[PDB]
Amino acid sequence: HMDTTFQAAIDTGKINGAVVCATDAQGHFVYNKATGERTLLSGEKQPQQLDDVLYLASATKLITTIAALQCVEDGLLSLDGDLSSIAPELAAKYVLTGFTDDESPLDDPPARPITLKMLLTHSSGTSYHFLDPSIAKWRAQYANPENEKPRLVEEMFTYPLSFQPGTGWMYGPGLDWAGRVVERVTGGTLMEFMQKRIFDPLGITDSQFYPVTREDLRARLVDLNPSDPGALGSAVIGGGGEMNLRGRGAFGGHGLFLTGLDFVKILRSLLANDGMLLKPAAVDNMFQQHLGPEAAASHRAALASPLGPFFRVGTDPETKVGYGLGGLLTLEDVDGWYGERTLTWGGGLTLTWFIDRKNNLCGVGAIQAVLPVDGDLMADLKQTFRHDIYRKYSAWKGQQ
Ligand SMILES: C[C@H]1C=C2C=C[C@H](C)[C@H](CC[C@@H](O)C[C@@H](O)CC(=O)O)[C@H]2[C@@H](O)C1
């Protein structure tokens, strides 16, 4: 269970603490717990607190997903519309299909336009070079000889597509592109849009994209410490290969900092479907399979690949899953755990979240790890959270 499992990891020195926040739609069952300690830049230790500012890493993707769907409500975008005009950098990408045996690249022009739905579901073709061996080999020719200049989204993610748009699945910068599209069609920064449309309606004021400049937030950053004087989020990412340090502007793929308490407000608004962020029908559409037949087969292949455990977010290999607007989507019940159409993703190696509408539960679990981060231990700690919270929910339901 969380209490003894987290304490054992603290005792071995592999984590400093954790923040866990879960709730049902109405706030009847609520579980909030901060465990352990944080270290300040001065070396002073403090108990972990529920309003400590956390690095969301790819938990950002859910929030960016919401922002893009709000633009859809506004009429500024559509899920299936052609993005070539707003994002010509995407339209100009070609599809890399393989290499000759003399290692010459083979590519083809894109067969169709890239759409917002493709960006939100990682079926556009844009792939992380560190997850896609083919794109990683292409990247190691057109080498940045480390021009160290800070780069916008469009200047960071310059690789060709990994497959014809709509026909595959690979995790990538789809939401960094979607965030840029939001900035272009609204005429403001992503932080401005999110603050007005997501944070203000929920009474959230303690959030920033990297770099965190606000003095009050920096005083509460878990990741501002002697192991991380740059507050880069190294502990969450598992090691510093920092995109954060080399970036310029907001990165909707991974950039946000937020408290656990504020993150669960976003989850619960979706779970309750209370109209604070999106109209109910728009939310319902998030919880559907949005991969086509070829993309779905590509998705299942990645889930069976050596990176599958990361892409499965703790779900069992026998459970059928798809990808919704915002994360992985389960397609069948697991009795005692996630109901069908549970949406789930995470950040780094240390953070995971879920929204289970059928069983009426949502929650985020964010381990605060010690460098160097033990990846196998993080998976176990995340699994303990994902199952222990349901055991706590059952006990509470039994006591009513
Ligand atoms: C749900 C999780 C799934 C993932 C899929 C593949 C990876 C393991 C992700 C972690 C990436 C991160 O560790 C790598 C970063 O160093 C990226 C970089 O800075 O180079 C992970 C995270 O995005 C969250």
Side-chain angles (χ1 to χ4, degrees), residues 167-213:
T167 72
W169 188 92
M170 185 40 68
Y171 196 42
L175 285 131
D176 304 274
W177 287 107
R180 280 301 275 147
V181 172
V182 169
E183 297 185 307
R184 291 180 177 176
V185 297
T186 61
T189 70
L190 189 57
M191 185 65 230
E192 278 161 3
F193 190 79
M194 291 180 169
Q195 187 61 62
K196 174 161 227 63
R197 296 294 287 281
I198 294 167
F199 303 147
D200 282 346
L202 301 174
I204 291 163
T205 60
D206 286 5
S207 179
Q208 257 189 310
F209 278 97
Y210 179 93
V212 181
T213 68

Side-chain angles (χ1 to χ4, degrees), residues 361-383:
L361 188 66
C362 77
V364 57
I367 306 298
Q368 309 304 308
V370 176
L371 294 174
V373 183
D374 180 342
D376 294 323
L377 174 68
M378 295 310 106
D380 187 64
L381 299 177
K382 287 182 296 174
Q383 283 295 62

Side-chain angles (χ1 to χ4, degrees), residues 57-59 61 128-131 171 236-244 253 307 309-313 344-349 351-352 382:
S58 279
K61 286 174 163 87
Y128 286 136
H129 74 83
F130 51 85
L131 306 178
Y171 196 42
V236 172
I237 303 301
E242 262 91 25
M243 304 184 50
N244 279 332
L307 293 163
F310 298 114
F311 299 151
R312 275 190 205 284
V313 202
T344 181
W345 206 245
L349 303 172
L351 184 158
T352 187
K382 287 182 296 174

Side-chain angles (χ1 to χ4, degrees), residues 79-204:
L79 272 175
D80 294 314
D82 185 349
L83 291 176
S84 296
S85 171
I86 306 149
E89 303 89 338
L90 290 172
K93 271 160 194 306
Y94 268 37
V95 177
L96 170 67
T97 60
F99 299 90
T100 181
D101 313 274
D102 75 83
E103 261 66 58
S104 291
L106 302 175
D107 42 324
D108 294 309
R112 58 187 72 71
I114 292 173
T115 70
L116 176 66
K117 182 189 285 190
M118 295 179 191
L119 296 179
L120 303 187
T121 59
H122 304 281
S123 57
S124 78
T126 58
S127 297
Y128 286 136
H129 74 83
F130 51 85
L131 306 178
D132 195 313
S134 171
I135 292 294
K137 162 160 156 190
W138 188 99
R139 179 184 185 258
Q141 289 163 9
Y142 295 60
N144 199 2
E146 199 42 17
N147 170 2
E148 72 294 28
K149 203 200 257 173
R151 276 167 272 170
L152 294 170
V153 169
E154 52 265 58
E155 308 157 343
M156 186 149 299
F157 301 115
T158 52
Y159 322 133
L161 304 174
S162 203
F163 48 76
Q164 289 292 338
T167 72
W169 188 92
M170 185 40 68
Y171 196 42
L175 285 131
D176 304 274
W177 287 107
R180 280 301 275 147
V181 172
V182 169
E183 297 185 307
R184 291 180 177 176
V185 297
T186 61
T189 70
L190 189 57
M191 185 65 230
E192 278 161 3
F193 190 79
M194 291 180 169
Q195 187 61 62
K196 174 161 227 63
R197 296 294 287 281
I198 294 167
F199 303 147
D200 282 346
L202 301 174
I204 291 163

Side-chain angles (χ1 to χ4, degrees), residues 323-371:
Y323 210 88
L325 307 186
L328 190 73
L329 186 77
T330 64
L331 299 169
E332 62 191 12
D333 289 339
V334 181
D335 296 336
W337 200 38
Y338 295 165
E340 72 178 337
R341 306 309 173 74
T342 291
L343 198 71
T344 181
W345 206 245
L349 303 172
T350 59
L351 184 158
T352 187
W353 63 264
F354 70 97
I355 302 157
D356 180 352
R357 307 207 296 171
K358 188 179 189 159
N359 292 312
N360 185 17
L361 188 66
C362 77
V364 57
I367 306 298
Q368 309 304 308
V370 176
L371 294 174

